[PDB]
Amino acid sequence: KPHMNLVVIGHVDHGKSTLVGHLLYRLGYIEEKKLKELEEQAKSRGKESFKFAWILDKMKEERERGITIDLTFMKFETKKYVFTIIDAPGHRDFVKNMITGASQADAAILVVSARKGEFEAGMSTEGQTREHLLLARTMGIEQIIVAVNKMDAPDVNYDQKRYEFVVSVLKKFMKGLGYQVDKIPFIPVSAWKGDNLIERSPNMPWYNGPTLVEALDQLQPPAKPVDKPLRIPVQNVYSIPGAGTVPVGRVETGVLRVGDKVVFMPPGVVGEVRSIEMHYQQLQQAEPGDNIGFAVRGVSKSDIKRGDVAGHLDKPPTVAEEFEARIFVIWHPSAITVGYTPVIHVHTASVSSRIIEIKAKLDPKTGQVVEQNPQFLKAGDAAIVRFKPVKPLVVEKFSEIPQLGRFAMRDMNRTVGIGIVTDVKPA
Amino acid sequence: LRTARKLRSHRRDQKWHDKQYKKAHLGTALKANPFGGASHAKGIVLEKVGVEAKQPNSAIRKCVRVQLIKNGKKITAFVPNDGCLNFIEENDEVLVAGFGRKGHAVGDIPGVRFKVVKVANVSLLALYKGKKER
RNA sequence: CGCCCGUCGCUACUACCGAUUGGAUGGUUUAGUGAGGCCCUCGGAUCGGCCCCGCCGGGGUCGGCCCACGGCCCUGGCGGAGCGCUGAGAAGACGGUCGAACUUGACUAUCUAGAGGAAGUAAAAGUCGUAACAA
RNA sequence: UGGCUUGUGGCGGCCAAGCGUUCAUAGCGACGUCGCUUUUUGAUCCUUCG
RNA sequence: GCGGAUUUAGCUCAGUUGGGAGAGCGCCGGUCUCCAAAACCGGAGGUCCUGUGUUCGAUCCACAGAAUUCGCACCA
RNA sequence: ACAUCCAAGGAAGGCAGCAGGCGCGCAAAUUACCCACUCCCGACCCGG
RNA sequence: CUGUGGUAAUUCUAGAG
RNA sequence: CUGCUCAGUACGAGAGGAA
RNA sequence: UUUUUUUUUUUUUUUUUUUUUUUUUUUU
Numbered sequence: 060k061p062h063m064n065l066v067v068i069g070h071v072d073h074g075k076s077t078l079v080g081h082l083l084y085r086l087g088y089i090e091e092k093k094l095k096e097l098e099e100q101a102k103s104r105g106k107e108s109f110k111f112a113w114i115l116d117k118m119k120e121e122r123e124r125g126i127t128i129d130l131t132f133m134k135f136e137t138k139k140y141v142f143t144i145i146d147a148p149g150h151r152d153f154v155k156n157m158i159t160g161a162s163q164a165d166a167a168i169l170v171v172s173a174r175k176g177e178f179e180a181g182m183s184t185e186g187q188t189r190e191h192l193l194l195a196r197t198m199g200i201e202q203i204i205v206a207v208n209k210m211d212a213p214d215v216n217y218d219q220k221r222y223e224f225v226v227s228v229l230k231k232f233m234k235g236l237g238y239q240v241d242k243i244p245f246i247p248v249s250a251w252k253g254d255n256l257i258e259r260s261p262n263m264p265w266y267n268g269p270t271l272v273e274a275l276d277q278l279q280p281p282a283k284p285v286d287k288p289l290r291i292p293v294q295n296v297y298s299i300p301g302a303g304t305v306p307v308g309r310v311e312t313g314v315l316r317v318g319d320k321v322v323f324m325p326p327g328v329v330g331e332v333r334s335i336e337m338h339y340q341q342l343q344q345a346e347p348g349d350n351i352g353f354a355v356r357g358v359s360k361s362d363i364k365r366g367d368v369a370g371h372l373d374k375p376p377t378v379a380e381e382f383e384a385r386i387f388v389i390w391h392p393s394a395i396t397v398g399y400t401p402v403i404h405v406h407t408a409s410v411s412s413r414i415i416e417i418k419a420k421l422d423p424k425t426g427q428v429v430e431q432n433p434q435f436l437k438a439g440d441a442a443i444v445r446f447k448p449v450k451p452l453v454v455e456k457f458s459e460i461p462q463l464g465r466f467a468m469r470d471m472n473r474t475v476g477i478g479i480v481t482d483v484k485p486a
Numbered sequence: 487l488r489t490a491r492k493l494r495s496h497r498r499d500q501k502w503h504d505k506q507y508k509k510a511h512l513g514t515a516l517k518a519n520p521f522g523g524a525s526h527a528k529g530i531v532l533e534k535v536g537v538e539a540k541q542p543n544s545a546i547r548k549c550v551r552v553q554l555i556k557n558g559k560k561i562t563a564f565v566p567n568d569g570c571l572n573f574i575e576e577n578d579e580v581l582v583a584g585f586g587r588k589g590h591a592v593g594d595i596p597g598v599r600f601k602v603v604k605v606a607n608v609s610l611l612a613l614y615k616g617k618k619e620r
Numbered sequence: 621c622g623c624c625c626g627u628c629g630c631u632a633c634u635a636c637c638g639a640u641u642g643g644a645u646g647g648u649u650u651a652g653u654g655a656g657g658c659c660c661u662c663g664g665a666u667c668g669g670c671c672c673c674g675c676c677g678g679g680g681u682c683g684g685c686c687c688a689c690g691g692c693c694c695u696g697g698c699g700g701a702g703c704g705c706u707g708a709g710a711a712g713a714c715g716g717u718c719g720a721a722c723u724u725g726a727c728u729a730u731c732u733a734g735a736g737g738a739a740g741u742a743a744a745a746g747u748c749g750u751a752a753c754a755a
Numbered sequence: 756u757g758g759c760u761u762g763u764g765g766c767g768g769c770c771a772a773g774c775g776u777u778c779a780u781a782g783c784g785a786c787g788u789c790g791c792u793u794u795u796u797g798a799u800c801c802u803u804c805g
Numbered sequence: 806g807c808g809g810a811u812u813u814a815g816c817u818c819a820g821u822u823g824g825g826a827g828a829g830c831g832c833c834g835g836u837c838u839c840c841a842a843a844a845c846c847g848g849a850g851g852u853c854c855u856g857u858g859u860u861c862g863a864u865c866c867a868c869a870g871a872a873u874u875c876g877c878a879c880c881a
Numbered sequence: 882a883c884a885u886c887c888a889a890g891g892a893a894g895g896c897a898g899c900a901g902g903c904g905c906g907c908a909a910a911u912u913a914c915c916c917a918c919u920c921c922c923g924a925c926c927c928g929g
Numbered sequence: 930c931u932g933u934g935g936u937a938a939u940u941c942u943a944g945a946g
Numbered sequence: 947c948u949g950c951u952c953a954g955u956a957c958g959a960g961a962g963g964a965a
Numbered sequence: 966u967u968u969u970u971u972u973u974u975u976u977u978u979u980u981u982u983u984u985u986u987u988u989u990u991u992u993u
């Protein structure tokens with residue numbers, strides 16, 4: 060049964076965690092006694108409507124504020140697939156976390172509230188339906204399902220006109236991003252009631268498409284590049300009684316087996332795999348797509364962090380002394396010059412990088428040079444630029460390992476530009 | 487031949503006059519230094535202070551005050567190589583060791599009984615010559 | 621125009637002294653309290669065997685043509701079912717020695733905080749006087 | 756104690772050169788001037804040593 | 806992960822409310838000397854840590870980074 | 882005296898035995914293969 | 930050993946033949 | 947006076963935060 | 966028998982940093 064990684068994305072409060080939680084529940088992955096206890100705890104803290112969300116949101120600050128802060132990973136299994144599902148935050152402060160999530164994903168569920176004002180807000184200039192869609196594209200997610208959520212809400216009440224309104228807006232925007240919009244399901248659901256999650260909903264007779272589970276089965280599994288050299292960007296590092304220090308991350312390329320000797324770049328520390336675990340099931344090998352924790356003998360937690368990359372010793376992950384990229388500028392309030400230093404979000408990493416030169420401005424559609432060494436770039440421009448990371452950074456050429464070779468540029472907490480790396484000068 | 491005990495007792499007691507023997511005899515070695523008799527102690531560079539040489543010799547000597555790990559006590563330490571200052575940064579882990587038998591510092595040095603040999607769990611020789619590390 | 625002494629002013633580091641009846645640590649502990657097992661006076665949820673009586677079934681003898689029947693010995697079933705006596709036997713419980721642990725203090729051994737007071741040592745030279753070396 | 760008076764104490768007030776980044780008064784006000792007050796203190800000797 | 810401080814001359818620190826910085830040592834240099842010490846003159850020295858926003862103008866504010874620090878959270 | 886999971890009711894534990902995690906530091910390994918050897922333990926085999 | 934049972938959970942374990 | 951809903955709301959670029 | 970012998974201080978504190986250089990047979 061093929062495995063897939065699913066990221067759940069969308070604007071703050073639109074219903075991401077409630078969807079995932081409620082889906083896991085009616086699919087029977089969550090103990091009724093636990094759902095009962097969560098509900099009681101939720102009511103007693105003034106937050107009844109967070110009972111499904113609190114399956115995913117566990118941190119003290121998440122519960123206090125009623126928001127997701129960082130990623131949660133859950134295994135569930137449909138008729139055709141086994142999914143690792145990744146719950147991502149909508150809050151603008153934590154889009155860096157959502158991005159690491161997208162970097163690990165094969166497909167995305169975009170959760171979009173149909174409630175009056177909630178939709179418009181998410182799709183507004185500085186909204187996260189807009190931003191998350193953009194970032195998901197740049198991190199290389201092609202398969203997308205959209206859950207038009209909260210159909211149950213009184214200000215919505217299962218209205219097909221409201222639904223078709225959000226669908227059309229979403230379609231015009233998504234097509235401008237390069238999505239193949241004709242192929243993607245727009246399912247009207249209620250993460251809270253359950254409508255169209257797993258079974259079909261009587262409240263919405265006018266809807267003929269897949270339910271969300273059906274839409275999942277209609278996805279297609281991605282290429283498994285087992286013959287390219289091992290690369291595992293670390294998403295987090297735990298220190299675990301019995302195991303020791305265990306990096307977690309999704310195997311992008313190559314294969315990893317217990318016994319293997321592995322190196323973590325850019326620090327250059329080397330350890331040896333004691334064990335491998337996916338969703339609490341011990342493994343002996345892990346292949347691309349596997350989202351795993353791997354115990355490492357001889358490595359201290361302080362040696363390694365998120366955004367580090369693990370490969371085998373003979374073909375270690377490339378550390379960029381500098382690198383070259385083709386970029387498009389989504390948004391900027393003035394202009395970008397040589398010297399501009401946004402943070403680069405690539406795979407699980409995020410490191411400020413200085414533009415040391417702008418070799419050429421390109422026509423954004425054709426790719427031809429329109430000017431050698433432009434005096435600056437502005438919103439709407441495309442370019443070939445050189446980048447020097449402020450601290451050691453791992454990147455690969457897009458042509459070689461695309462999952463370590465696509466990136467976003469962010470500055471003053473906004474997404475400014477997008478990029479693919481066309482060349483790397485190794486450290 | 488029957489007076490053996492006096493000579494036996496006399497020897498051990500007169501022996502107390504040997505200070506090094508005395509040093510082993512009294513639990514002093516364990517408590518006379520921050521180490522506890524230990525050859526090496528990991529530490530942190532609290533500050534870097536330049537110091538002046540003693541007597542006719544005139545020089546600026548590189549000196550570091552170090553906070554020890556288990557001990558938690560102030561230490562006066564000597565920086566050894568030429569431009570080690572360029573390579574010594576505040577709060578980088580440092581391993582320290584002593585000079586020629588415990589007691590007195592090199593005659594040129596003032597109040598330092600300790601030597602700095604590691605930076606960030608890296609030996610000094612490597613930073614000092616270009617071929618090794620940077 | 622040689623050596624040489626001490627107070628006094630900087631700067632640093634050791635050790636001595638110390639209002640707080642000073643704080644911290646670990647060992648032996650006086651006394652008051654006392655879990656818990658165990659020996660031991662009991663108790664007695666409960667179980668079985670024989671005691672007495674009546675009724676039938678079956679083996680062996682005696683008084684009866686019988687057959688039922690009665691007596692002895694041995695079992696099966698029912699009532700006074702436990703009503704008479706016996707044995708092992710859980711909860712509990714008398715009084716104990718052992719004796720955790722609690723508290724209250726002791727006491728050693730082992731470090732330690734502090735306004736100030738007082739030496740020294742780095743000690744090259746600032747400032748006062750000539751003590752010692754040539755009666 | 757009480758009492759005249761209010762220097763001293765306390766409080767408002769006319770004028771607006773200034774603060775208040777632009778501007779005087781939103782919020783404050785030099786100087787200069789009008790006063791209210793009798794829980795401070797002061798001066799006065801009127802009532803109380805028969 | 807979150808949140809606070811701090812970063813200004815070779816050194817150590819002061820300023821500030823956006824018109825753009827200021828002192829103590831320094832240390833160096835010269836005179837005297839074998840050379841210093843003392844003495845006496847002389848030195849002009851800062852992307853105000855960085856990007857962006859705002860603005861006519863950003864050392865200063867806002868928003869974002871780095872580095873150092875200090876709280877707090879998380880806990881394979 | 883530590884301290885693990887709590888369906889709120891309870892239930893456990895003594896890795897100073899191999900491995901393996903942490904801690905501690907100046908300072909010491911791997912979550913392996915096996916009864917073939919040396920023995921030993923159970924009853925007349927050949928288990929462990 | 931049959932069957933009949935209770936508990937989040939442990940080498941839990943009743944009652945009945 | 948305090949709490950529960952009012953409500954992490956309107957108003958904010960946030961910090962925040964009502965009635 | 967042969968020898969003393971007075972005199973005595975009226976007035977002299979101090980002197981910065983650093984100082985230096987050494988090694989052998991064999992005769993032509």
Ligand SMILES: *C(=O)[C@@H](N)Cc1ccccc1
Pocket residue numbers: 295297307336351352881
């Ligand atoms: C260890 O649990 C990982 N395999 C799963 C995980 C838990 C917490 C944080 C990160 C990863």
